[PDB]
DNA sequence: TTGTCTTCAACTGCTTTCGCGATGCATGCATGCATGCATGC
């Protein structure tokens, strides 16, 4: 009853997405008309926008104005009537289950089986139980079992590493026996930071644009390994090998490295330093409500 | 107008004997991830 961490499937689901986005396109085409293939799905899904430290959202103010009824019954069924037929052609080539699937999604029903629910089979149902027991044991603070789970999981030739916070917290409350925590974190980062589609990202990703998980997690957690102090110039040397260098938040990680080094003219240059990266992190992002707090601290330093 | 030595000044050649010693721009294969197509049961 939880998301699976393996690449969803082969099967039907492609032909279903076919039917879906093909029909979508026929209706939206005739709709702009009246208002006046993996690739068809691709263009289709394509032309569309793809007191505390909140990445504040973009709120409503310069946005738009009001609309007034577009769509009576007699006029919707206009736009519906033709594309449904063109659909009657390749519907003739997809399978019965997907005839009825398209039929119902087109009546506006919504399925009550899931892609997981219907992908039957010895092996996957076993993985499903394995991963469940993982997520359960981790909820239970049963770090030992949990760990056993995780290990037998990743042993299996199907699981992609989308279960890393799995370890990153698991191996984290497991001081016991294994290289851990930062080990995993900076490992993830080093491996998946270069070149060396669906079924993806925010908490996994590749290069050229940003990479939540591994990056920021080791990138603060090492600074927490320096709250273990009271290391830094290392974290800021290899933090100081950008660029993605639009990673503004990592600009704030850098400025944090300088406020922690600051804790004689050396300490000056470290406070000068943090003063610089805070605004080069006015790049944009959006942190630290008043930087005048950071700066009141920097004046407690200036003493 | 015209003779010509007059003058300055545009071209132009060499230099002690031996060994150790190309740049840019278009074409296409390369890599990787995702749909399609062919073999088999």
Nearest to A297 by CA among A253, A263, A254: A263
The CA–C1' separation of A196 and B33, in angstroms, is: 13
Residues A283, A245: Cα–Cα separation, whole Å:
10
Measured to protein CB atoms, the chain B nucleotides within 7 Å are 32-36
Nearest residue to nucleotide B32, by CA–C1' distance, is A195
Measuring from the CA of residue A200 to each C1' atom, give the nucleotide at the shortest distance.
Answer: B33
A121 C-beta neighbours (distance < 10 Å), count: 9
Residues with CB under 7 A from strand B: A 14, 18, 37-39, 41-42, 195-200, 206
Q: CA-CA-CA-CA torsion for A120, A123, A127, A133, nearest 10 degrees?
A: 100
Record the tokens describing residue A46, joined without a space: 């394509």
Is residue A248 within 8 A of residue A283, CB to CB? The reply is yes
A200 C-beta neighbours (distance < 10 Å), count: 10
Residue A74's alpha-carbon distances to A71, A122, A244, in angstroms, are 8, 50, 54
Nearest to A86 by CA among A33, A42, A41, A27: A27
Sorted by sequence, the CB contacts under 8 Å of residue A235 that are 6+ apart come out as A222, A223, A226, A257
A187 C-beta neighbours (distance < 10 Å), count: 15
Is residue A14 within 8 A of residue A39, CB to CB? The reply is no
Alpha helices per DSSP H over A36-156: 38-46, 73-81, 83-86, 96-106, 115-118, 122-139, 143-155
Is residue A176 within 8 A of residue A214, CB to CB? The reply is no
The CA–C1' separation of A192 and B6, in angstroms, is: 90
Domain ranges of chain A: 10-50+72-120, 121-303
Resolution number, Å: 3.4
A291 Rama class: left (phi>0) / alpha (psi -120 to 50) / beta = alpha
Residues A256, A167: Cα–Cα separation, whole Å:
26
Residue A36, classified by CB atoms within 10 Å of its CB into exposed (0-12), middle (13-18) or buried (19+), is exposed
Residue A292, classified by CB atoms within 10 Å of its CB into exposed (0-12), middle (13-18) or buried (19+), is exposed
The CA–C1' separation of A138 and B13, in angstroms, is: 94
Q: CA-CA-CA-CA torsion for A219, A221, A223, A224, nearest 10 degrees?
A: 170
The method of structure determination was cryo-EM
* Sign of CA pseudo-dihedral A153, A155, A161, A166: positive
Q: What angle do CA A151, A155, A156 make, to 5 degrees?
A: 125
In eight-state DSSP terms, residue A90 is G
* Sign of CA pseudo-dihedral A225, A227, A232, A235: positive
Residue A128 has, within 13 A of its CA and on its CB side, a CA count of 14
- Angle at which helices A291-302 and A265-280 cross, to 10°: 170
């Amino acid at each position: 009853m939880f998301e699976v961490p393996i690449t969803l499937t082969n099967r039907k689901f492609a032909q279903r997405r076919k039917l879906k986005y093909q029909y979508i396109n026929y209706i939206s085409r005739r709709f702009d008309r009246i208002s006046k293939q993996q690739k068809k799905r691709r263009r289709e899904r394509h032309w569309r926008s793809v007191s505390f430290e909140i990445w504040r959202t973009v709120s409503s103010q310069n946005k738009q104005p009001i609309n007034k009824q577009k769509m009576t019954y007699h006029n919707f069924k206009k736009i519906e009537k033709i594309p449904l037929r063109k659909m009657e052609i390749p519907l003739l080539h997809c399978t019965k289950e997907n005839k009825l699937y398209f039929q119902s999604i087109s009546r506006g029903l919504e399925p009550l089986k899931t892609s997981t629910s219907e992908v039957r089979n010895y092996r996957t149902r076993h993985i499903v139980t394995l991963t469940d027991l993982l997520h359960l044991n981790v909820s239970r603070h049963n770090w030992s079992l949990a760990y056993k789970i995780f290990a037998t999981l990743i042993r299996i030739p199907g699981v992609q590493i989308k279960s890393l916070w799995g370890i990153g917290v698991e191996i984290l409350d497991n001081l016991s026996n294994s290289s851990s925590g930062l080990d995993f974190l900076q490992w993830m980062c080093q491996i998946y930071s270069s070149k060396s589609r669906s079924i993806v990202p925010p908490f996994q990703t590749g290069s050229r644009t940003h990479t939540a998980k591994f990056a920021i997690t080791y990138l603060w957690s090492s600074l927490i390994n320096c709250q273990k102090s009271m290391l830094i110039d290392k974290i800021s040397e290899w933090v100081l090998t950008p660029p993605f260098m639009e990673d503004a938040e990592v600009w704030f990680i850098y400025a944090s490295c300088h406020l922690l080094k600051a804790d004689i003219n050396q300490v000056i240059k470290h406070i000068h330093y943090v003063r610089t990266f805070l605004k080069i992190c006015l790049d944009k992002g959006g942190f630290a409500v008043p930087s005048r707090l950071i700066e009141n601290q920097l004046k407690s330093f200036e003493s």
